[PDB]
Amino acid sequence: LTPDVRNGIDFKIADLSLADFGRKELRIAEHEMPGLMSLRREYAEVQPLKGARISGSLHMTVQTAVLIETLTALGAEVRWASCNIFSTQDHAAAAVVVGPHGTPDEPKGVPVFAWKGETLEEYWWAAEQMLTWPDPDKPANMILDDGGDATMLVLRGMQYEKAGVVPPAEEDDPAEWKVFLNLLRTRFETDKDKWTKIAESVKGVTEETTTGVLRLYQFAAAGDLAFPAINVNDSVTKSKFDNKYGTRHSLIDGINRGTDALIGGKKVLICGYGDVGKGCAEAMKGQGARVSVTEIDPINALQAMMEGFDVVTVEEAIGDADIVVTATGNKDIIMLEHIKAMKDHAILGNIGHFDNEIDMAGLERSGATRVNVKPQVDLWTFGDTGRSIIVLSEGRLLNLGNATGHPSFVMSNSFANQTIAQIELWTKNDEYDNEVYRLPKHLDEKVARIHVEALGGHLTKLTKEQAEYLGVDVEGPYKPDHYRY
Amino acid sequence: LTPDVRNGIDFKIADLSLADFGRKELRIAEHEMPGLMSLRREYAEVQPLKGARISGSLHMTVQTAVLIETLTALGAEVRWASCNIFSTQDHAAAAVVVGPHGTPDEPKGVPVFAWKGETLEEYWWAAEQMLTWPDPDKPANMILDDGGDATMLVLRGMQYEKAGVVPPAEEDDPAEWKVFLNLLRTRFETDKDKWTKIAESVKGVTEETTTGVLRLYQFAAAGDLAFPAINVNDSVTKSKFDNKYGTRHSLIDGINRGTDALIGGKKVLICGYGDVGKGCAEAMKGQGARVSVTEIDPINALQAMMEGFDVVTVEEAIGDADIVVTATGNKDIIMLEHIKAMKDHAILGNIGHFDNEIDMAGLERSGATRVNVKPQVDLWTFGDTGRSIIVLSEGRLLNLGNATGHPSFVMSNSFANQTIAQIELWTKNDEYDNEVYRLPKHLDEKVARIHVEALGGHLTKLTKEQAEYLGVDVEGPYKPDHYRY
Amino acid sequence: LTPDVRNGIDFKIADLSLADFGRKELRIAEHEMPGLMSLRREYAEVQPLKGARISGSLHMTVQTAVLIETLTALGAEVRWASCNIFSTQDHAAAAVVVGPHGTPDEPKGVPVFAWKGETLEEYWWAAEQMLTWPDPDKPANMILDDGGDATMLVLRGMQYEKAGVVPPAEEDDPAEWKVFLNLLRTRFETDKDKWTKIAESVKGVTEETTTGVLRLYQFAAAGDLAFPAINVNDSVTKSKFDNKYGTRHSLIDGINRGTDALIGGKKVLICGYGDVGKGCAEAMKGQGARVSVTEIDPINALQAMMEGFDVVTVEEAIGDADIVVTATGNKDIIMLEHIKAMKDHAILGNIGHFDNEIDMAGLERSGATRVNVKPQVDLWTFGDTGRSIIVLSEGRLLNLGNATGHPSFVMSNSFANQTIAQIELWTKNDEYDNEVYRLPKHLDEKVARIHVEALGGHLTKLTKEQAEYLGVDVEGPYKPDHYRY
Amino acid sequence: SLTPDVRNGIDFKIADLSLADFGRKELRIAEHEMPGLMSLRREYAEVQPLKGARISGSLHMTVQTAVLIETLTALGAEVRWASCNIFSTQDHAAAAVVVGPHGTPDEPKGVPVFAWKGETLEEYWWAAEQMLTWPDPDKPANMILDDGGDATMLVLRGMQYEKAGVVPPAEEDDPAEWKVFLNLLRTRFETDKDKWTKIAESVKGVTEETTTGVLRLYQFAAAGDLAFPAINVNDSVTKSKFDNKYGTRHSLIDGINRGTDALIGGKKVLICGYGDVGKGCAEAMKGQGARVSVTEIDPINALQAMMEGFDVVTVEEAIGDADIVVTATGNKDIIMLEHIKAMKDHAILGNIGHFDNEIDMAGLERSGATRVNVKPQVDLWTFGDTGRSIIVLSEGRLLNLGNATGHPSFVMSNSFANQTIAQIELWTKNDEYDNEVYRLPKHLDEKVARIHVEALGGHLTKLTKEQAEYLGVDVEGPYKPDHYRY
Ligand SMILES: NC(=O)c1ccc[n+]([C@@H]2O[C@H](COP(=O)([O-])OP(=O)(O)OC[C@H]3O[C@@H](n4cnc5c(N)ncnc54)[C@H](O)[C@@H]3O)[C@@H](O)[C@H]2O)c1
Numbered sequence A, B, C: 001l002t003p004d005v006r007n008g009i010d011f012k013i014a015d016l017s018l019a020d021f022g023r024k025e026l027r028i029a030e031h032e033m034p035g036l037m038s039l040r041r042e043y044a045e046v047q048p049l050k051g052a053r054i055s056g057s058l059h060m061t062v063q064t065a066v067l068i069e070t071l072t073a074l075g076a077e078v079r080w081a082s083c084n085i086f087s088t089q090d091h092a093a094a095a096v097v098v099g100p101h102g103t104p105d106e107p108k109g110v111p112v113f114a115w116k117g118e119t120l121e122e123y124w125w126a127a128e129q130m131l132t133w134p135d136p137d138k139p140a141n142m143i144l145d146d147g148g149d150a151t152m153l154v155l156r157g158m159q160y161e162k163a164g165v166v167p168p169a170e171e172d173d174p175a176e177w178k179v180f181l182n183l184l185r186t187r188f189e190t191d192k193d194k195w196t197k198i199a200e201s202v203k204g205v206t207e208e209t210t211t212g213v214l215r216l217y218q219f220a221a222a223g224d225l226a227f228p229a230i231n232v233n234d235s236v237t238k239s240k241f242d243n244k245y246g247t248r249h250s251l252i253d254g255i256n257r258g259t260d261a262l263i264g265g266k267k268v269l270i271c272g273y274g275d276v277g278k279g280c281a282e283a284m285k286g287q288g289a290r291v292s293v294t295e296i297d298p299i300n301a302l303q304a305m306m307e308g309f310d311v312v313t314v315e316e317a318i319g320d321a322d323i324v325v326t327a328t329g330n331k332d333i334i335m336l337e338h339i340k341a342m343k344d345h346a347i348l349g350n351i352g353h354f355d356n357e358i359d360m361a362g363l364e365r366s367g368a369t370r371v372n373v374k375p376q377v378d379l380w381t382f383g384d385t386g387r388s389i390i391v392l393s394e395g396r397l398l399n400l401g402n403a404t405g406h407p408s409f410v411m412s413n414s415f416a417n418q419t420i421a422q423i424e425l426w427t428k429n430d431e432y433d434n435e436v437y438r439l440p441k442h443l444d445e446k447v448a449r450i451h452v453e454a455l456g457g458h459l460t461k462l463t464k465e466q467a468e469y470l471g472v473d474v475e476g477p478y479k480p481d482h483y484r485y
Numbered sequence D: 001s002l003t004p005d006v007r008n009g010i011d012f013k014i015a016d017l018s019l020a021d022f023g024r025k026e027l028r029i030a031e032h033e034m035p036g037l038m039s040l041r042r043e044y045a046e047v048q049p050l051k052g053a054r055i056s057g058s059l060h061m062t063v064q065t066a067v068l069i070e071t072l073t074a075l076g077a078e079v080r081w082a083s084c085n086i087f088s089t090q091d092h093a094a095a096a097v098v099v100g101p102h103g104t105p106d107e108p109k110g111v112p113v114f115a116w117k118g119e120t121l122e123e124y125w126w127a128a129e130q131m132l133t134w135p136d137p138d139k140p141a142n143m144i145l146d147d148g149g150d151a152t153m154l155v156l157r158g159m160q161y162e163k164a165g166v167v168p169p170a171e172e173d174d175p176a177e178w179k180v181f182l183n184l185l186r187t188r189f190e191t192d193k194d195k196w197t198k199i200a201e202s203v204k205g206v207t208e209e210t211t212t213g214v215l216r217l218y219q220f221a222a223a224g225d226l227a228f229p230a231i232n233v234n235d236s237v238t239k240s241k242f243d244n245k246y247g248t249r250h251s252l253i254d255g256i257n258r259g260t261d262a263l264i265g266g267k268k269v270l271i272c273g274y275g276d277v278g279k280g281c282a283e284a285m286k287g288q289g290a291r292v293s294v295t296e297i298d299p300i301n302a303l304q305a306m307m308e309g310f311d312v313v314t315v316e317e318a319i320g321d322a323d324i325v326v327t328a329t330g331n332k333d334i335i336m337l338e339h340i341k342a343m344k345d346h347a348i349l350g351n352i353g354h355f356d357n358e359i360d361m362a363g364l365e366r367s368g369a370t371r372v373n374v375k376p377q378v379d380l381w382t383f384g385d386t387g388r389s390i391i392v393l394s395e396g397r398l399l400n401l402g403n404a405t406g407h408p409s410f411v412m413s414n415s416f417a418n419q420t421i422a423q424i425e426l427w428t429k430n431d432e433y434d435n436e437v438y439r440l441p442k443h444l445d446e447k448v449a450r451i452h453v454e455a456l457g458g459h460l461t462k463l464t465k466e467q468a469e470y471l472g473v474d475v476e477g478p479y480k481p482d483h484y485r486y
């Protein structure tokens, strides 16, 4: 379509009149997010992100809305879009455009391009607008990314400019791939150096998620990582708290809002048992489900068995499982042949990445019929067997599609890491090369201590003899770099 | 307020057009409810309930619609009303008026008087409409009650018609008591034998929850139970499953939809540790919460400590609690002095009974300012401390007000008990005196069997020598009458 | 054998020199057994049990030691025998014979006829020794019993006396039945009226375990209960604590002493999900095990599924099970054919009753080879499959045979029930008929309160208005009598 | 002032050789639970990779270790063994080891062992020296397998005092073990002036089993006093995340249950430290229904603690009403006499970490409290001024091993599998290794894991050619980046 404009701010959301509801919820998230509020007070005078022009691509939720206003509290200008077609919280997007001090007729916030229920075409357009700053002599100079979509637009964009052509999409490529090229091919017809000029301008990217960090590795190994990158995902306080315990919280929320199906007493299959696999399984156990897991990695599999779970393959467990949940971050986990053998009215969901863990393209062209129950709940029925399957969020993240994603105090951790990673890549750009980096242990321990204190946990303080005995400083770090917690 | 009437059906709901949506979730729900679906098969030809005119007072949820259409499949005529002002699922209510083979233009289901977010005046108007059948010759001849507001309206209704006067409300009476008395008083100045006529027509009551069953004990003690009552609550497959595992599910959902407070790592105070208290503590402990309990009973209290919870008074733990849940079925549990001691932005909710476990009158009278966040969530702020708390559903059942109540498969237990109870009191009425009964053990066992079979469990069968050793029939019952499971 | 006699106390134990070790652990246990130490204090001056001559059949442990010495503190005379051939803890029996003030040279305690590792013959000789008081004018006038063996001697012995003959055993009879029949026959020669005299003298029996109480229920239905009986098993503070939270303690101890098998990660099969079964499953799940349950009762079977356990048959699960535990109180659970199907080096144990849950006579006669590894551990090998299984305590109670049984504090609940039952039946004998009984709610509540105050927990006291709301006294009882906790 | 037994060419010193029939029974049973070790015997039998190895071992002398020992010898090694703790030796295990699968108490056919449960500190360091002192002066120890770094410390400190030419006088205020350690090296330096230096030349590598052992290994290295290559066995994922945590979940319960008859559920339990060993302690108690609080110095460990449902507190604020207190820090001075005086009457105190210094046993024994021994490794300590008593397990030394029998077999299958691979690699590939602390590669860590998964019956998924490609891993693994924390 065409961006909305109002009082200096271009944007495109569902409804600005939701801003008042949003503001109330933001204000409440603030009291649950000490990672960001503590970062606001510390960096208030310094203004470390001044000059920064951050293009962000992360689910547009209340929690992100508090992160965005942490970045502007520290000097930055931002533009934003979501990273899933279903995860935008519309009242959040609207509080963000309107700002703490504006009204919907006079918005005083930041540009936002997101709404719940985008098509694939609307998602890539919203993307483009987030990356395309209004003065051509001042492009995006930082990226905050989730799952690697922004970075993939710029780096593929550039790689097709440099080559003078965008390749025509093969028929058997995702329909999102067809859409992605169309955006660049149509852009290239008019502007030949657009993504090149943005790439050469961006001083670093901070990436939130495991799947995004796998893409960052494939760019650096091919030699195309065109700017420094921080792996925020693998901070101890991100991966072992947001990936695991945010999920222990929000799988349950996703499933309860989608279905009115009992968890306890049912057979649940969790695919993959990494940090997201771990949390899915612990929530289900705690609700008294009969859990089984799949894994490729014998270490991760031995962990499952020790925590009380059968390790099995999909084809062994599929036709008896009541609830099936993919959490591997890999493709082609649950296929049409598997869906076809699922019990009647079994629940299928993905909590990992994109929509390729579950074979959605195969299911659509199989001859099953779909009845939409409500947004992001669809019942599919096979005429030959008579059996039906409930599918959540069209195979895309069910905790963000069917619910609200992880609670506020969990994102306080993940986003404290994101704020810290932006400061260090902006103010210290000189010390980093075009490779993937992780934040030092002290910064990880900084963030955790904030939350330990907010919870009321009373840390023991080492004596001088005890620090000497351990080979550590009283103030930390307390552990070796390889330490696994 | 006047009832709507299409194709001979009087009703008052939120929106008929929601029926399609409702009907889709009712069909899904029938697949989750083997207990009720078994009973429709079994008694289809017998029509055991032909001639029944059942007035029901019970949360008008999707689970409850599956029940109502069970009673009608078994031959009954029913009229319905919710028993909480927040508990109606308007799409459920719509599906029920319209019936499996009707449409909103030509509905073919049953009279319903129910919408989400009724006022106290609308609530009681509804109950009267539900108890008042079209033909003054054919009143209600059966009651289905959840909490005892249908039984109270009839039994007190007749008490005041006999005294020849409905007393004034004292100025300190509970607002619902005054609203309730205003109903009986206004009916009496036009119709002086109304409640006596229905009370003498009513062949029996089947009662759903603990609180309702206590009322039934106090009417029977005072000589004032005018009809047989079955205590469905204390069916084994109801008390130990609905109250415990149902709540383990639906406590989480309520807090998740109301807030985005993380549960893991948080200090949670459960008040009361009977079966609702036992579900609440197990839901929270499985999400990582540090739980403590309050109890008056030394036995329940010793059970709590043996499952790893501190047993404390509200006085000593209120200031530290991140979430406070009241689950006692008794009043005066969390007083204004206690709300005022709560940490800034803590969560207060009740999952027990009515609205008086929490001092909601005192809170509302106190001078505290209320800001409404969204439906059933309010933030209250004290200008003396500067602290706020979040209160869910105005102090009323949080699981059915903020979310949707216990999930379907649980409610197949409760409502197969309720159907079985209505078949018994209707068809064997001669055999019952005017007092409180509980169902026979073999009936509990038959209910549970359905559910074990549906989930896929395999029950062992006793040989003739083991049945003999045990002193039991191979087909049960298997336990002494005092057995506690 | 011939009883030993020193300082006028007849006895027969393993080694009196253990008394010293015995006394320090007895004293240790007192600090852990509030219910018994409180009763000693309350009824100190009263001396309620003066005149009592208590013949007790109960596992001769440090816990029981504490009981025996409670009953003597309150006035009674006692004589004791274990109720399991392997349960005696010989240092505890030493200390009971020597008494708190005696020495091995000059004992000042009570007659004990117990050692660890008895033969069936020694077992029953010990039984008759404990029931046979020195003075023919002053027989036993009370029985404290666990499993019903002492009651069985008196009542069957009295049956053959009134009939004039003790019958022949058939070659089919179990080894212990033929030894039981042997003892009574050999006595009917020199003493025609021994047991009739004791039945008439016995004022009542108190019975500690589920299986004992079944035996009593069967004596009452056959019109043969010669004296009142108290079912201590089915006190709330016994069944719901000892049967379940004691087993959750002692099942684990028995397996760790018998073997060094990891529990975590292994498949476990628990036969029976009553109270002992519910505690077994709970132990294994908190240690990491993959637990499945077998059951005949569909209610108990559905409680299992809701706590995260498949309900399965022995036929379908026996070959996958690393540990098999029987928890039924029924005979014929694990037969020869099931043992032969067990995987190599799997552990078989029984925590229920006697030794016929496991087909131990089938095994012993099968052709299999036994290597004794150590006391109460044996490896049995099938020359035809070449597989070996480990059998704990020869199929008798694995928690008392291989370990020390339930811990001190759990037994303070069960044994304060027992002391209270003995005071009731002795000092208030007139109020009890010749049928089976359970203690009054208030007496259960008294027991729980003692142990709740000892653990640090704080009960809330009902206000006068809250007590009326509920229709209970501020001091209780607090629950209806069918109440299930 | 004590000298070895010698029979059939074996020198040794144990409790009772007549316990060998019993021990062999338990050993064969343990083999069925240890496929990590049984797998390596099969893979490497034909090749015999440890030929020429003469391994001095200092690791608790348990059934579990017995299978380790008899695995190292199936692979060609010669071994001499002693326990690393004075209370952890299982006598019947020591016997079956000396006597071998095929010998007899009169004609033993196994390996020298210097170990009995309940050694004095003089007998511990004497057994250590023997274990390290091979019969042929030409051929001393050429490999170490150590647990907590006591063997490594004798060799390196021994050496250090030979080169300064004086074993230094023990202070007035030094741990009684330190006084006993020096006294050993000073009596020997009289009659042999280059004993330890010759051994340190001959030792080609050490493999260290435990977190405290590795702390000490890190300190020698920074001193530039690490004389030989060292493999950090503790820090494999399959040792650290399965022995330290899930082993302790099992055997903490066993220690407390054998020591006392105290119910765990319902009680207030306090765990100091929340690393791998602290996390297993907590999980065990939780699952027993305990009311658990933890202490921590590290805020990351502390936040994990709270997310699993535990108050995070200090000793001083929780000590007064804990029913059970367990230290798992591997750091010193956690429970001082002041804390002990504050504990509830008949409360339990134990140590599951290291040595004897987590708990102030030196201050406790000099305080005027009186001691009554209940049974081995159970002592009741009573304070005259309060009337109060505490139960102390294992004199403040490893309770899982002192009061019970250590981790179950299937748990050690993982640690000792990591130990057997460590020894193989450091012997057959010694030239690749500098004098530094080293960890094993991920594929060896996944190979150990795969052995046990498959024993337990877990069925892993196999990646398609396209799946492995997307992840950028080979089908056969490794599956995870090197920073990955599991
Ligand atoms: N939805 C959310 O809120 C959320 C939060 C965090 C991360 N994530 C996403 O979840 C996914 C998992 O991330 P993680 O942090 O757990 O990663 P992880 O690397 O820790 O775990 C992935 C696990 O999947 C296993 N696996 C891979 N292919 C498999 C297959 N075919 N079958 C079975 N197992 C297989 C791997 O062995 C690995 O252990 C990623 O896509 C990540 O982006 C989602």
Ligand SMILES: NC(=O)c1ccc[n+]([C@@H]2O[C@H](COP(=O)([O-])OP(=O)(O)OC[C@H]3O[C@@H](n4cnc5c(N)ncnc54)[C@H](O)[C@@H]3O)[C@@H](O)[C@H]2O)c1
Residues within 6 Å of the ligand: B460, B462, B466, B478, C209, C210, C211, C212, C242, C243, C246, C247, C250, C271, C272, C273, C274, C275, C276, C277, C294, C295, C296, C297, C300, C327, C328, C329, C330, C332, C333, C351, C352, C353, C397, C399, C405, C406
């Ligand atoms: N060892 C101890 O420390 C200890 C403690 C308490 C009780 N007990 C003994 O334990 C036994 C059980 O006691 P409880 O109170 O748990 O019993 P319970 O009556 O509550 O339950 C026993 C369960 O076994 C089930 N059952 C019966 N036959 C079966 C079969 N063939 N297969 C599967 N399930 C079957 C029944 O359905 C029942 O639920 C009794 O014999 C009791 O005397 C032992």
